[PDB]
Rho GDP-dissociation inhibitor 1
Amino acid sequence: AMVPNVVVTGLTLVCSSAPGPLELDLTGDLESFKKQSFVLKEGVEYRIKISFRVNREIVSGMKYIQHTYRKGVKIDKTDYMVGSYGPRAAAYEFLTPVEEAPKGMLARGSYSIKSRFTDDDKTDHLSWEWNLTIKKDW
C-alpha cells in the first residue's frame, strides 16, 4: 500500500511536423494501445518523450529500452540512459535523441515497439507495447 516511488505517466512521439499530438497515457489501459497506431510521415525527424514521477527516494541509473519489431521479427534493440533523480512534485521529461523515420516503399508500413522503463536494480517500473505506421504522407 505504500505509495510507489516511480510512476511512469506518459509517452509522447515529439514531431513538430505532425498535425496533432501523439500521446499515450501510461497510467491507463495499456492493452488498448495494441489496437492503435501513430502515423508518422516517412523520413521525418522525431524524438520520444517519456514522462515520469519520483515520489520518495533517489532512483539510480534509470534506463529506457525500446525493442522494435516488423511482422513479428525483432529488427532493433536500443537502450537509453535516462539518469538518476531525487523525489519531487513536478514531472520529469526524458527525451531520446532525434532520429529520422525510415523512408521508401520497403520501409513503409507498421512497426510494433516493446518499451520498458527500468533502473540499475532492473526493476520493471513499467512495460508497454505500442505501434507506429510509416506512410508516404500524414
The chain has one domain: 1-138. DSSP finds no helices and ten strands in the chain. The longest strand covers residues 73-85.
